[PDB]
Design a protein around this nucleic acid. Sequence first.
DNA 1: GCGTCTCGAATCTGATGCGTAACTTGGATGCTTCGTGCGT
Length: 236
Amino acid sequence: MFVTQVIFNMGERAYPDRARAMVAELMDGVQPGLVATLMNYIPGTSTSRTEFPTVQFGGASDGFCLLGFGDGGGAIVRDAVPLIHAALARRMPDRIIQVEHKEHSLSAEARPYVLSYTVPRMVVQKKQRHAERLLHEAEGKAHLEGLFLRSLQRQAAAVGLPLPENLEVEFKGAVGNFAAKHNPNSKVAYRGLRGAVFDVNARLGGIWTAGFMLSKGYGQFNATHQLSGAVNALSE
DNA sequence: GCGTCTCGAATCTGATGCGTAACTTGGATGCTTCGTGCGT
């Protein structure tokens, strides 16, 4: 029902993957339970869970942000943020780290017409053949709409939010593509989409997640702020 | 088409007098006979 978003103001835009790597690195050894809980690890092992992650990372314009889902997510972010703040203060002795703590109510109500919803970061590259299928809407709609529907239903079930039984979505398109890597020296990269616009006949309150593999910082979007239509101020 | 943070706090939180007076303060009755005269 409640989503907690915490932003650490480091002063520079850090990509979410390196952010998660470094926050893992800072908490090595001290308070192992916090590390296991924050990294989405099975108790007793360091492996991650295939299930939807309750721990969330995102790329803030001024830094990186922690997102908790549900009471468990809220509780973990609440007892976690002082520790990561202390670690960041320890590592960066000559910079002030600022913490912004804001909560979003999560609500999804139906609506007999559609609204323009978009995201900056979709994980859509599965096969190279499907990548060229985006020229025709009909061929590429099936897997994209299926991905959106499954992502929405699984995140709703994870957060326990009621959703209508009659959601239909049609895709519009994206702005461009981008490449992302595990490490700067890694030779493995994936393709995402920026401005992937799709129309849904329902309202989405608060911040929302779509796609899969979200903990590394993909598929987060504030649907509520997008409805304000502040995307007009994009020019040079 | 909701946006969110903030979404108070401390302290006082009754004092003082006045907080009865005067007067009434019981009274009365509870038996028959006898003589003389009316009296209907």
